[PDB]
Design a protein around this ligand. Structure first.
Ligand SMILES: *CC(=O)Nc1ccc(NC(=O)C*)cc1
Lengths: 505, 13
């Protein structure tokens, strides 16, 4: 029954030229698609599915386009129904129906397309080939937030792991429409789904500026306080991707204050993302360095390093953020003293101990060099044991140059630079001399890198004001390279080289 | 999550 006559007869009536006959059949086909017994017999007839697909495109009766689209939506709830729609050219037809002025037809099309993208393989290639990405981006102007949540998930399925789909979304004005969704609506499922689309569009370097200049950084920061954990997480991931390519963007004030307060979260992954974003945003941006220090960023970052312990995924961006804040802005002296006043020097020196790796050690040394600029930190850094390790790391980096993505010359330049600034204190120079560092500093004068020559002669100039020290430097044969460095074009090298030669007599 | 899109599909159409 049915398959023997009713469906062949209904297929024959569904493609009749009499529009009234087509509309009468389409209503019966829609009713048969609402029960498992008859609905199975529809998807097992590719002749019927073809008639439903063609009628949906060509008809001008709204009730018929609603019945045919509503039919196709009913077959899309299971496996063999999705395959029958796929093989009957249903995907290019459903893409065409996305431009329908009828809401019932538009909703039936986007839900059937979403079911196909979720469970039918080969549907991603078919939706892209039929121009589905363009039609979906243009539909982001609609106001139905339930419809917007489905439309954005289709874009996420199409764009994930596909450069063509990402480029089409960006070329059609995608970022502006997505940022406006985060900026306007409060529906959690729409905001969450849209953030997953902005996350995929932010993993490439050349695709990030579109989201940034449209105000995406501020729009994503709006929902960092929302109770949805998956929404906050996707916002923090997208902000961390966009952050390194948006260190010049104006108006990051309100976002920085929220990121500082997220450092007090109980979610360790939230603190990790917030520390990484603050590290990128504070890089070479004196305004971002200012606002972070004005909201208590030093205490929150020092507290974050303590909480992390040996978790280098948290200490490294937090130490890097502290290195940025302690240099090159009005409140640099304030940040340097604040690290001491909030008990950061012990854990900062402790991070030079094992089991820290080289990327964390490199960032920790640069921060100590910045903290050594403050004279009130000379004694506490000495009493915490910073000098013996700064020398021991310097010796290790000299053996592998005379790793883990860290050039061992940056360790040599950084460690000697901290000792060069620490040597401004009289008691520090006694400790630096007592570890047989003068022979090592003399051999650094032969280094081909100017910044290493400048800091080696700098720490030798500071140690040379001790009379017995100037002779040990002369005894190690430093007069020959120093006289060479006198003719250096770098004024910093020639200045310190003349200073040592002058103090050796 | 899980079958959370089907509940949304149902309320829309
Ligand atoms: C798991 C599952 O099948 N869920 C589900 C939720 C909702 C609906 N439909 C409506 O609420 C109308 C079907 C299935």
């Amino acid at each position: 029954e049915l398959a023997t006559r009713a469906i062949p007869e209904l297929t024959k009536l569904l493609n009749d030229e009499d529009q009234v006959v087509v509309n009468k059949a389409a209503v019966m086909v829609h009713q048969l698609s609402k029960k498992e017994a008859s609905r199975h017999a529809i998807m097992r007839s590719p002749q019927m599915v073809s008639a439903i697909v063609r009628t949906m495109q060509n008809t001008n009766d709204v009730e018929t386009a609603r019945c045919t689209a509503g039919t196709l939506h009913n077959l899309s709830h299971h496996r063999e129904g999705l395959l029958a729609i796929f093989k009957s050219g249903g995907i290019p037809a459903l893409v065409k129906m996305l431009g329908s002025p009828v809401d019932s037809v538009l909703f039936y099309a986007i839900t059937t397309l979403h079911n196909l993208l979720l469970h039918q393989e080969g549907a991603k290639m078919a939706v892209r080939l039929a121009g589905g990405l363009q039609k979906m981006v243009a539909l982001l102007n609609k106001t139905n937030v339930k419809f917007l949540a489905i439309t954005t998930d289709c874009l996420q399925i199409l764009a994930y792991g596909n450069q063509e789909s990402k480029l089409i979304i960006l070329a059609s004005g995608g970022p502006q429409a997505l940022v406006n969704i985060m900026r306007t609506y409060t529906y959690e499922k729409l905001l969450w789904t849209t953030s997953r689309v902005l996350k995929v569009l932010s993993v490439c370097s050349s695709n990030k500026p579109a989201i940034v200049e449209a105000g995406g950084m501020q729009a994503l920061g709006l929902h960092l306080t929302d109770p949805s954990q998956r929404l906050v997480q996707n916002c923090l991931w997208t902000l961390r991707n966009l952050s390194d390519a948006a260190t010049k963007q104006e108006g990051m004030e309100g976002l920085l204050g929220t990121l500082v307060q997220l450092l007090g979260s109980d979610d360790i992954n939230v603190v990790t993302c917030a520390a990484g974003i603050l590290s990128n945003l504070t890089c070479n941006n004196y305004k971002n360095k200012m606002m972070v220090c004005q909201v208590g960023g030093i205490e929150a970052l020092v507290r974050t390093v303590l909480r992390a312990g040996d978790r280098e995924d948290i200490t490294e961006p937090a130490i890097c953020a502290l290195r940025h804040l302690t240099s090159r802005h009005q409140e640099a002296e304030m940040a340097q003293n604040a690290v001491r006043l909030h008990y950061g020097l012990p854990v900062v020196v402790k991070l030079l101990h094992p089991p820290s790796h080289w990327p964390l050690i490199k960032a920790t040394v640069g921060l100590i060099r910045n903290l050594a600029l403050c004279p009130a930190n000379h004694a506490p850094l000495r009493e915490q044991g910073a000098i013996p390790r700064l020398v021991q790391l310097l010796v290790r980096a000299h053996q592998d140059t005379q790793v883990e993505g860290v050039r061992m010359e940056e360790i040599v330049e950084g460690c000697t630079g901290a000792l060069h600034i620490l040597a401004r204190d009289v008691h520090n120079r006694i400790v630096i001399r007592g570890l047989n560092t003068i022979p090592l500093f003399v051999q650094l004068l032969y280094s081909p890198i100017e910044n290493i020559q400048r800091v080696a002669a700098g720490v030798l100039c500071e140690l040379a004001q001790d009379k017995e020290a100037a002779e040990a430097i002369e005894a190690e044969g430093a007069t020959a390279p120093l006289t060479e460095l006198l003719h250096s074009r770098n004024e910093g090298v020639a200045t310190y080289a003349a200073a040592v030669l002058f103090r050796m007599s | 999550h899980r079958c959370e899109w089907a509940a949304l599909h149902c309320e829309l159409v």
